[PDB]
Symmetry: D2
Subunit: 241 residues, 4 copies
């Protein structure tokens, strides 16, 4: 039923992020960095080889140009700037994919860019259009909400398929958005809390939001973070299914 | 007969380099930056649109990762690092090309990378292999010499076509290499000197090297720099032909 | 009476910004880049030598880390991140100042950072505290408004002197803020409009805002941009006085 | 007798390098990154607070501008470029030191820059002069050799004190240089080998070089790498003394 995704290839130079070798065999979808928040060219090659080696679907994980902030800070870019930096990043990653006989299978924006799309029509249009410009049929992954009507409508105008994503290890606000990271309790560090939220989403059942009040979602893809070490050491919830 | 090339799309953010709008209509080949020495994504889009608009053939102009040095400083990278950063840059530029119904037609390394290939077999192999990995038939542009036997042999092993390039506005050393920029007289600022060197190459006739001694070359492509303002204001030597 | 300021040392690597050699002798205050939006170390050395050579007061011109955006895009940083990046940049520039027998005489934030301080108490506190941490008495330059009561109060808490700045070549909104650059008419390109706005400020007289309605300011410092070529070719309004 | 040094504050954004919290209490000297190979401003603040908290002497650890290469790749910069980037980095770090009531106590170049000084008089002169320009008495740390006559002479011309450094966890070539990292066996991963080499240096006794042949050194400072996990888990050789 629901697919597991995970942000990977987020190492950079001599610095390691996550634990891609462990997480790759457990997920369906690898959202790989494209050098703007992480993932230098050699790291990118390695992330793709590792994904290819485990049969995992590769998404482009593009970000704002902000290495020191890990692409988790909103940067007030024009739609024109965003279109071009998405296109650039998709093509850079796809170069490695094709040398390894595969291709970029979807796009999942990283960090503040991903969250800025939830409230900004002009940025989502720009991102959708970059996807369509690159390849007919290339899906964009966006935040599942109770009502995804705005996203469905814009995706229709651009003729881009959408993948609706939910999160196992992030606290949700009442309004359907994710709790900002600049605030305690935004990431779940209780493994049992992560498992329960994940399975509530998998089943379309209510789960506790940030304030412990019930929130209901259904999603095509479920994100688990390799950054988060508890979400790592509990990742064998693939077996729960 | 001989094709004119020129390094373009080398602006970056708010900073302008060259004069692409003037130089583009006068050349056959536009070597476009890929974001490592110059050419942010929006600049890249613009350089491609401008090239497309004038019927000019687009080459990828990849460099070492060195913005503050404009990619003109040798960086001791591994062959593995170089392979990946070339592949990355070709794919980033090609994303813009295909959105505009064309494609990257060749590769010309920029700056120190280009010159480091003249003496380093392992780097040239890595660069040749990146070209082959990206697309069957994608040529690499290299420095024309009296004897290009080493390059022909490695290109044959990789099955990559070669384009032999000479320079109108750079002083040559007796040994066939270009005079390093960290030394006066390395760039011609006498327009008449530029025209004469260009036409000596176009005709396969001898021209004065760095020390005024005669050097003979024949080449498939002739580089003129838009950086260099005299080489710009003398660029209507296209008409000389 | 009123001092002229100008953003300078904003070249970066091989790229030139402004025309520092012309503008430096005409101004009282040189707001020098610190490597985050512009101004690599060698450019910084050169900007300081040029300022020293003309008797001009040197300010640190710190920005968000955003080279491709020229520091003109708001980046959602924490107060902690902003404090540290200001301190870093002041110390980097001051290293060159002291090697040349002078010192950083004030701080003027660049780009989106400068404008984000007008509405964000927590960022202004962080910036004020970086100034105080670096040196007792080091002034911060901020946007002159009709009422500067919020800034005076926070500056008092930090015990940092304030310099109130107005702009000759930027259109003002009715509310006292500058018109965002992502909107036509934000920069004056009519030289006569620039001269008139400058002298209205110099005299404390009303001038036309963005919508041509009158706005009154008095300021300790008047900014003229070397980016802006009309504001450059009209800069001999120093003589108007 | 001999002082222990260790490269620290080499984390960058969300990426962690080393284990500064463990290594700081065991060393005499903390060589802190300055943002060119590692160490963003907030990481720098943290490294300084941690050093201050444990009574450790703080050195500036400046590098070539090369984040993706961790400053371990030689970059052909001019002496002028190197002078300025050293000065810049010393001043950036010193800003944090002084806000915490201390100061930069010496300079140790990082990565390829450090090794390039061993063979390049013009770069060592430029680096020595940056030290002297910043502060009278600020020592430069350089590679201890059998004969340090070239370094002593240039340091004398610049009137900069020298600290002679040896390495516990790096293999030495017969000629006194360190084995390049682009070659197996360059870093010791045998803890006992590290302890023995360290104590041979501490005592001025011979130890096995890269080829197992004896090499004799005496040094003022002994480097142990927090990068290297075996050199970390054997760092309680401070107690050996």
């Amino acid at each position: 039923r629901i697919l597991l995704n995970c942000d990977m290839g987020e190492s950079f130079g001599a610095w390691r992020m996550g634990d891609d070798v462990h997480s790759m065999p457990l997920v369906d979808q690898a959202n790989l960095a494209c050098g703007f928040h992480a993932g230098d060219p050699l790291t990118m090659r390695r992330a793709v080889e590792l994904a290819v080696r485990h049969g995992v679907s590769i998404g482009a994980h593009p970000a704002y140009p902000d290495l020191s902030g890990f692409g988790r800070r909103s940067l007030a870019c024009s739609a024109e700037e965003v279109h071009a930096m998405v296109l650039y990043q998709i093509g850079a990653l796809d170069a490695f994919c094709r040398s390894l006989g595969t291709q970029v299978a979807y796009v999942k924006p990283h960090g503040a860019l991903y969250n800025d799309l939830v409230g900004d029509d002009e940025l989502l249009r720009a991102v959708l259009d970059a996807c369509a410009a690159y390849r007919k049929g290339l899906p964009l992954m966006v935040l599942a909400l109770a009502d995804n009507g705005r996203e469905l409508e814009l995706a229709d105008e651009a003729d881009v398929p959408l993948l609706f994503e939910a999160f196992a290890d992030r606290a949700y606000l009442p309004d359907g958005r994710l709790a900002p990271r600049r605030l305690g309790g935004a990431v779940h560090h209780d493994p049992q809390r992560i498992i329960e939220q994940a399975l509530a989403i998998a089943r379309g059942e209510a789960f506790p939001d940030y304030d412990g009040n019930p929130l209901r979602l259904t999603a095509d893809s479920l994100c688990v973070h390799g950054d988060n070490p508890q979400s790592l050491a509990v990742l064998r919830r693939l077996r729960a299914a």
